Design a binder for this molecule. Structure first.
Ligand SMILES: Cc1ncc(C[n+]2csc(CCOP(=O)(O)OP(=O)(O)O)c2C)c(N)n1
Ligand SMILES: Cc1ncc(C[n+]2csc(CCOP(=O)(O)OP(=O)(O)O)c2C)c(N)n1
Ligand SMILES: [Ca+2]
Ligand SMILES: [Mg+2]
Ligand SMILES: [Mg+2]
Lengths: 844, 845
C-alpha cells in the first residue's frame, strides 16, 4: 500500500525532528513551536489507517509488523518524551543505526532494577539535602547551588560506575561553579566537615595564596562494579570554559603514559553552563582538537547544566543564535541527547548511551541536561527582578527528589518510609561530618618534590663522545628517503658540525638538547604551529620524502629504549592549545613539554592561560608546571605583530618565584636552558624569548665543547679580551641587541665599554650580575640597552634589580627605542634608523 | 511502484551526500572515499530500471516525469560537479526548498551572457596579471599572493555587482593576508603606482607609526548595474580572524544610523583562510552573535579561501577534526556551498545564490572556495620541503585564467586574440600605474576632527533644573508596570535624590549622565554581561514587569527627539563582543559606545582586541576610537578573579596619548567622566576602573550641585579642612583605597597627613597634581598607596610621573600589598589583615 510508504516517512520525521516537540523543560514554562511533520495528517494518515497493521522497517522495535496505533505511540514515546535525541545530522550510517538500536528497541522507556531506582533516589536526596543544609548552616553565603539540576549527581555517579563497568581505569572531570560543592561532597568524597570548616573560615595551614572554595579540585578512588577507579577533579579559575582544554591535555598525558593508543582507559568529562558553552570560543577550539592527532583523547563526554538562564540573562535571543545552546557540537557531528532533569531514569539511560557511544566510536558526545536554577545566580542575588515568571513557576515547582519519589510510590517500586528515611539518614550523616559517599576509597599507591629553588645544582655536563654520536645519528636518514635540496643542505651542514668542521648553529644545539633528553629516556612533547619544520626553517625535526609523502623523524630513531619523542604541527589556536599543553605538563612533569608560538606576538590570544594558570597556579592551587614556551622575539623591521613577545608583560607577572623569563643569546645557552628545565629538579614555567635573525647570525655559534662542558649562564660576562682597568661604562642587555652592540664596538675599535648579557631576567641572578661587574673597578656609569620601546621590554619592571647590582656611587641610564603605543614601526626604513640610534647612544 | 520509492531515496541521497563525491579539488590530488548511497545499486536500481520513466518527486528540474538514466545524470550534474552543496542539515523546510529550486532548476550547469563570461575572464586576467607583475618587479618580497585562488576577484565583484543590483547601498569587507593586495588594486581601486611605491619603501609623510602594506584598509564608490555602492575594506592586524567581529560592529553601526532594521542596505562580507576559520574560537563566537539582538546584522556572507594548506601544515588530521574547514558553520545551520575554483562560472553562480539566500532569510551563508596556493606560504618560503606532492602537482597545473580561456574558446564563446590582449592591456595599465577598476568612482561628500588633546575645554556644565527634571522622568514608570520591591525601593531612593532629600549614589549619577547625552540627541550603546540590571544591582536600566514579562526602559523615554538609547545583555563572550564594540565606536564616534566587563579580571580574554586595536589603532591606522570600557575593580576579599582589572597592564600599554585610564572615586566624577567622553571633541579609548563596593558606600555620594556645576577633576585635593602647615606627609591614591585611608585618618584624629586622589592616571595630569601639592610647603615625604600588589597596580608604571611631581627635597615611598603571583588572596580573613596593614603603613609617619 502507499500508506506503508507514508508510515516510513513519519518514522524518519520523528528521528529528525521529534526532539523539537519533546517535553524537555521541567518547568513547562514556554511552549515549543509546533512542527507539522510530526502529525500524521501531514502524511495523510487518518483514524481508519490507525487500526491497520504496518511494517516497521528500520524502526528497531523488535516486532517486524505492527498496528499504526502502536507505531505512532512508539514514535512519541521514543522521540517526544523526556529524551530529545539529536543525531540524524551525523553522516556516519553505522553510528546513526547504532543510536536507533538503543532508543527504538526500548521504545524510549528504560528498565532499571529496583535497587538501581533506590540508588537514583538516594543520590537525588544527597544532592537536595546537602544544599538545604548549607543554606541553613551558612545563610547568605556564596555556594553555587545545584538545586533544580540535582539529577547531575546521579548522572555523574552513573557515569563513573559505568566507566569501571566497561574497564576504564581513570576519570578526569573539569567543571564550573554549578554544583561544584555538591560534586566534592557527594561524588568525590570530600568530608562535609572540611567543607563546613571552609565556610566558617577556619581552614588554614598553607603559604598557598589560595583560591575560593568552588575552584578547588580533588582526587579519590571510587568503587565501581568493575573495581576501583581513580577520580580527578581539576582546579579551575573563574574564567568559565578554559578548564576544558586543560583537562584534555591531562588525560592525553595519562593516555600517553599508559600506552592507551585508543583512549579507552581514561575518560575525560567536562561540565558546562548553557550560556558559557555558547558564548566562549574555546569550546569550538577544543571541539576542533577532538580528533586532531596531536590532541585527540578518544572522545569526551560533555554535560551541559542547562538551567535556561545565565546570571540575569534568560532571553534566548540575548544568549545565542540557535534553538539549543549545544548546537556548537554539530561542528564535529556529535550526537546530542537532551533530557528532562525531572526524569532521573531517562538521565541515567541517556548517560549510559552517551558513554557507550564515546567508547564504541571514540568520538565526543553531548548530554543536554535541561533543568532550572532554584535560587538566584548566587544566594545573595535576587532573580525575580529580571526573571519574574521563571521564579513564579519555580516557587510552585516540586523538587526532583520529591517528584521521583512520587513516581516510585505510584508504581509500587518504593514506599514513602524508605524515601523519608533517606532524607533524615542523610541529614544525620552530614551532622557527623564524615564522608557520605559509600563508594569512596582511599587512594592506592607522592615524590620527588619538584619545587626546588632555581639555583639548585644540576648535571649540566654530558659525555663529549656521546654528544657527537648523537649528532651523527641525527644526520642519518634512510637512503630511500629523498630530502629537498635545501633540507639535505641543512643536514650536510649538521654533518660538518658533528665533525668539528663548523661551530654549531641554534637549530643543531636545540636538536642536540632534545637528543640527550630522549637518550636518557625522558619524554619530549613539542607543539606549535609549524613546529615540525620550524617557522624560520631552522628545526626540521620531520623530514618529508620528495617521492611519496612519507615522513621520517630522526629524534624518534636515536636508539631503542629512548624516551618517546613527538612534535606536532598544531591547529590554528593558541588559547586551547596552550591550555592543553599546560594540562599535559602539570599531569606529567618528568619530561619536557614545549609550546611554540609562531611569533611571540600571538601568545596574547592565550592571555587567560598565562594569567589564570601558568603564572598563578602554584600559589592558588599548589600546582607545579614545567611547561616551556618558545616565543620568537626580536626587532628586525617586520612590523608591530612580528617584533614583540611582550616581554614586559611576562616580567610584570613575575613574583614569588612563580616563573622563569629567559633570553638565550647562544646556541649553547638554549641547549643548557632546555636541559636544565628537565634535568634540574624544579618544575616551574619557562618563558623563552626565541631568536629569529639569530638562527643564522654568523657570530651566534657555539662549539661542541660549550655544550658538553658548559652550563646555563644566568649572566654572561664580557667575551672580548678587554682590559678591565680600561672600562668606563658597562652596558647591560639581552637578546640579539648584544650582537648589534658587539659588532659596532669592534668596528669602532672601542675598548672603553664592556657589554654584559643577562640571559635570565627573572628570577634575577644577583650575584652572577655582580660577578660579571666586579673587574671594572674604574666604571663610572651603567647602561640598560634594549631594542624595545621604553614602555615595553625589561626597563620598567627590572630597574630596581639592575640598580641594586651597581656600585652605590654610580647611576644607571637608559638607551633604547622611545616609548610608543604600537610595539614597532610599520616601515623598515624607520626601524634601521632607530636601531642605529639606540646602539650609538649606548656606546657613546 | 516499489522502484519508484527507491528512486526518491536515491534523489535525497545526493541532496544529502552528493557533495562528498563532488569534484571539488582543482588539483585532483587525493581521492575521496566512496559513498555507497550515491550509486543506484545500493537502492536496488539496475540497468533495466534505468530505461523506465519515473517520478522525480520534489526534484526541481522542471520535468515531473523522467527516465531514470536521465534522473541519475541530472543528479550527478547537480550535486557532483564543481559545486558541493551542504544544506540538508538545516531544519527550516522553506530554506531547503529555496536552495533546491536554485540548484536543481539549472541542473548544475548555469547560463551566463557572453559579456558576463568576458568579464569573468578579464577579472581572472587582472588577478593573475597583478601578482605576476609584483613577482617580476619585486622578487622575493612578501606579498601574500592570491594565485591559485584567482576566482576570488570575479566572485567579489559579482558580490558587489549583485548587491547594487538588488538595491543594497553599502558593502563592508573584512579579510586576511591572502589576496589582500589583489583586493585593494583590482576591486577597491587603489592606484597601482601607490602600491609600487610602498614596495619600494618610498611611502612617507605621516606620523602614523604605521603598519605593513597588507593590513591597510580602503574606501571607494563602485559602479553597479543598480548604481553606486559604497565600499569599505577594514584595517586589520596580523591576528587572523579577529577582524570579523569588528566588521560586524561597523555595519551594525551603519545599519543603526541608516534606520535599516533588517540589514538589507549594508552587506557585511568576511573572507577567511581554511586553517584560521577552523582553529580560531572567535569564529564560533561571532556565529553565536549572528542572530542575537543587539549584534545581528541580518547575516554575513562568509568566504573561505580554502587552499588546502595553512603555512606548512596540509594534513587534515593536524588542522581540524572534520572533513571540511567550514563545519563550524553548522552551529547556526548555515548552508555551505563548496565550489571548485577552476570553474569561475560555478563560482559566480554560487555567489549569486549565497547573496540571494542571505537577503531572503537574513542569515549567515558560507562560500567555500576550494583552490590552491601557487607559491609558498609567502614568496620567501620553500613549500616543497613539507608538501612535496602538492607542489609537484601545482607545478604542472595551469592557472584558472588559462583554463577558463580554454573553455570559452572551445565553445566558440571567445577567441584566443581577445584573451591574449587582456593579458597585455592589463600589464600596460599596470605600467602606467593608474586605477585599473573600470567600476571605481570617486566618493561623494569628514571634518569635525576628534584627535584633540585630552586637556581641551568642554561644556561640562548643565542646567540644574533640567538635571532635576531629567531625574524625575527617570523615576516615572507606567502604572501597570509592577517593580520588584527591591527595585521600587531603589527608584524611591532615586525619587528622594531628585528632591534633594538625599545625595546621589553611583548609579543615579551614572544614569543621569546617560540622560543628558540622549537629551542632547546623541546615541548611547551599552553592552556587557547583565549590563541592563548591572552585576551589582546598581543600574536597573531595564525594568521587568512582575506580572507579565514586559520591559520598560526609562532612559529610552526621556523625551521624544532624544538620541536612541540601547542597553544589551551581551552573550557570554568578551573577545568577539569587545571587538564588535570597537567597530561600532570607530564607525560612529559621535555618540557614547560603552562595553562593560562583569569583572575587570575577565577582560584579558579579549586581550588581542586591547593590544592590536584599542591601544594601537591610531598610530597604526589613524583610527580614532572613543569606546568606553567599564572594568569593575577593587580589593574586597572576593579572590584572584574578582579583585583586579589588571590596571598595571593598561598603564604599561599607555604611550603617545593613545588611551585614558581613569579611576573615578565619586558619583559626580563618573558623571563628568562619562559626559567628557562625548562632549569633549576627542575620541580615544576610555579605560575605567569601575567600583564595586563604592556603589553602596555611605561616603561615596554626591550632590546635584556637583553634577550641574562641577567638572571632571584629573586630581582631587584634600577634602577635609586640614591646615596646610600642619601636614607632614601627602598620600597619593586612587579608587576605593582613598575611603579606607580617609575613614582611618578621621578615626585616628590625624591632621598631619593629606590624601590626594589621582582620578586620571594616564595621560598623567601633571600641574593638577602639583596644584594639589602646593599648600603643603612643610611636607617631608610622599607616599603612593594602593590595594594592589607591588608588581601590579600603578606603582611600576607611574613612579616617574609621581617623582617628577614632588618637591625636590622630598622622596616618594610605597604603601600597599606585597608583590605576588596571584592578583589576590583566596581567604577573606587574610584580605583584611593586608588591608589594615597597608592602610596603617601609609598613615604612620
Ligand atoms: C570567561 C568568563 N567570562 C565571564 C565570567 C563571569 N560570569 C560568571 S558566571 C556567568 C553566567 C554563567 O551562566 P551559565 O553558563 O548559564 O552557568 P550557570 O551559572 O547558569 O550555571 C558569567 C557571565 C566568567 N566566570 N568567566
Ligand atoms: C591568531 C593568529 N595566530 C597565528 C598567526 C600566524 N599565522 C599567520 S598566517 C598562518 C597560517 C594561515 O593559514 P590559513 O588560514 O589557511 O591562511 P592562508 O595563508 O593559507 O591563506 C599562521 C599560523 C596569525 N596571523 N594570527
Ligand atoms: Ca579566545
Ligand atoms: Mg546556566
Ligand atoms: Mg590556507
Amino acid at each position: 500500500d502507499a500508506k506503508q510508504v507514508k508510515v516510513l516517512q513519519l518514522i524518519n520525521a520523528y528521528r529528525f525532528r521529534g526532539h523539537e516537540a519533546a517535553e524537555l523543560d521541567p518547568l513547562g514554562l514556554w511552549q515549543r513551536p509546533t512542527v507539522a511533520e510530526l502529525d500524521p495528517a501531514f502524511h495523510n494518515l487518518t483514524e481508519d489507517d490507525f487500526e491497520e497493521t504496518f511494517n516497521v522497517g528500520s524502526f528497531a522495535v523488535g516486532q517486524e509488523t505492527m498496528p499504526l496505533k502502536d507505531i505512532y505511540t512508539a514514535l512519541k514515546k521514543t522521540y517526544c518524551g523526556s529524551i530529545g535525541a539529536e543525531y540524524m545530522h551525523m553522516t556516519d550510517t553505522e553510528q546513526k543505526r547504532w543510536i536507533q538500536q538503543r532508543l527504538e528497541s526500548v521504545v524510549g522507556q528504560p528498565s532499571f532494577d529496583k535497587d538501581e531506582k533506590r540508588t537514583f533516589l538516594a543520590e537525588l536526596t544527597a544532592a537536595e539535602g546537602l544544599e538545604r543544609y548549607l543554606g541553613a548552616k551558612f545563610p547568605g553565603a556564596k555556594r553555587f547551588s545545584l538545586e533544580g539540576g540535582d539529577a547531575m549527581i546521579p548522572m555523574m555517579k552513573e557515569l563513573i560506575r559505568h566507566a569501571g563497568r566497561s574497564g576504564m581505569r581513570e576519570v578526569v572531570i573539569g567543571m564550573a561553579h554549578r554544583g561544584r560543592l555538591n560534586m566534592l561532597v557527594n561524588v568525590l568524597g570530600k568530608k562535609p566537615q572540611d567543607l563546613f570548616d571552609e565556610f566558617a573560615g577556619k581552614h588554614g595551614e598553607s603559604w598557598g595564596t589560595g583560591d575560593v572554595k568552588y575552584h578547588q579540585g580533588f582526587s579519590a578512588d571510587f568503587a565501581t562494579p568493575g573495581g576501583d577507579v581513580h577520580l580527578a577533579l581539576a582546579f579551575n579559575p573563574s574564567h568559565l570554559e578554559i578548564v576544558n582544554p586543560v583537562v584534555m591535555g591531562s588525560v592525553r598525558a595519562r593516555q600517553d603514559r599508559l600506552g592507551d593508543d585508543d583512549g579507552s582507559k581514561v575518560l575525560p568529562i567536562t561540565i558546562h553552563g548553557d550560556s558559557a558553552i555558547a558564548g566562549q570560543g574555546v569550546v569550538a577550539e577544543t571541539f576542533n582538537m577532538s580528533q586532531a592527532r596531536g590532541f585527540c583523547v578518544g572522545g569526551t563526554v560533555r554535560v551541559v547544566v542547562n538551567n535556561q538562564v545565565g546570571f540575569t540573562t534568560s532571553n534566548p535571543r540575548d544568549t545565542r543564535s540557535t534553538m539549543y545552546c549545544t548546537d556548537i557540537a554539530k561542528m564535529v557531528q556529535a550526537p546530542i541527547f537532551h533530557v528532562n532533569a525531572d526524569d532521573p531514569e531517562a538521565v541515567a539511560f541517556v548517560t549510559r548511551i552517551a558513554l557507550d557511544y564515546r567508547n564504541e566510536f571514540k568520538r565526543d558526545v553531548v548530554i543536554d541536561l535541561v533543568c532550572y536554577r532554584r535560587h538566584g545566580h548566587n544566594e545573595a542575588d535576587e532573580p525575580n527582578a529580571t526573571q519574574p515568571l521563571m521564579y513564579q513557576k519555580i516557587k510552585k515547582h516540586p523538587t526532583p527528589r520529591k517528584l521521583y519519589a512520587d513516581v516510585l510510590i505510584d508504581r509500587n517500586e518504593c514506599d514513602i518510609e524508605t524515601a523519608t528515611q533517606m532524607v533524615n539518614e542523610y541529614r544525620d550523616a552530614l551532622d557527623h561530618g564524615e564522608v557520605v559517599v559509600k563508594e569512596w576509597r582511599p587512594m592506592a599507591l607522592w615524590s620527588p618534590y619538584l619545587g626546588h629553588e632555581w639555583d639548585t645544582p644540576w648535571s649540566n655536563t654530558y659525555d663529549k663522545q656521546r654528544l657527537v654520536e648523537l649528532g651523527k645519528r641525527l644526520c642519518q636518514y634512510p637512503e630511500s628517503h629523498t630530502l629537498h635540496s635545501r633540507v639535505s643542505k641543512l643536514y650536510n651542514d649538521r654533518t660538518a658540525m658533528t665533525n668539528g668542521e663548523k661551530e654549531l648553529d641554534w637549530g643543531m644545539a636545540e636538536t642536540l638538547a632534545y637528543a640527550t633528553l630522549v637518550d636518557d629516556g625522558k619524554r619530549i612533547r613539542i607543539s606549535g604551529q609549524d613546529s615540525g619544520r620550524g617557522t624560520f626553517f631552522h628545526r626540521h625535526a620531520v623530514l618529508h620524502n620528495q617521492n611519496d609523502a612519507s615522513t621520517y623523524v630522526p629524534l624518534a630513531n636515536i636508539h631503542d629504549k629512548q624516551g618517546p619523542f613527538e612534535v606536532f604541527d598544531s591547529v590554528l589556536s593558541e588559547e586551547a592549545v596552550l591550555a592543553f599543553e599546560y594540562g599535559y605538563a602539570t599531569a606529567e612533569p618528568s619530561g619536557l613539554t614545549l609550546w611554540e608560538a609562531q611569533f611571540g606576538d600571538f601568545a596574547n590570544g592565550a592571555q587567560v592561560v598565562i594569567d589564570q594558570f601558568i603564572s598563578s597556579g602554584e600559589q592558588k592551587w599548589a600546582r607545579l608546571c614545567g611547561l616551556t614556551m618558545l616565543l620568537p622575539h626580536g626587532y628586525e623591521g617586520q612590523g608591530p605583530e612580528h617584533s614583540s613577545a611582550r616581554l614586559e608583560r611576562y616580567l610584570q607577572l613575575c613574583a614569588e618565584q612563580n616563573m622563569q623569563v629567559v633570553v638565550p643569546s647562544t646556541p649553547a645557552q638554549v641547549y643548557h636552558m632546555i636541559r636544565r628545565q628537565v634535568v634540574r629538579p624544579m618544575r616551574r614555567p619557562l618563558i623563552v624569548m626565541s631568536p629569529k635573525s639569530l638562527l643564522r647570525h654568523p657570530l651566534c655559534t657555539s662549539s661542541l665543547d660549550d655544550l658538553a662542558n658548559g652550563t646555563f649562564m644566568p649572566a654572561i660576562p664580557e667575551i672580548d679580551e678587554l682590559d678591565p682597568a680600561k672600562v668606563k661604562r658597562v652596558v647591560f642587555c639581552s637578546g640579539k641587541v648584544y650582537f648589534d652592540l658587539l659588532e659596532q664596538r669592534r668596528n669602532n675599535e672601542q675598548d672603553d665599554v664592556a657589554i654584559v648579557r643577562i640571559e635570565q631576567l627573572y628570577p634575577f641572578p644577583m650575584d652572577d650580575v655582580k660577578a660579571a661587574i666586579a673587574p671594572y673597578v674604574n666604571v663610572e656609569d651603567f647602561v640598560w640597552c634594549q631594542e624595545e620601546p621604553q614602555n615595553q621590554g625589561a626597563w620598567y619592571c627590572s630597574q630596581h634589580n639592575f640598580r641594586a647590582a651597581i656600585p652605590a656611587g654610580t647611576e644607571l641610564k637608559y638607551a633604547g627605542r622611545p616609548a610608543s603605543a604600537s610595539p614597532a614601526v610599520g616601515y623598515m626604513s624607520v626601524h634601521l634608523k632607530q636601531q642605529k640610534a639606540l646602539i650609538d647612544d649606548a656606546l657613546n
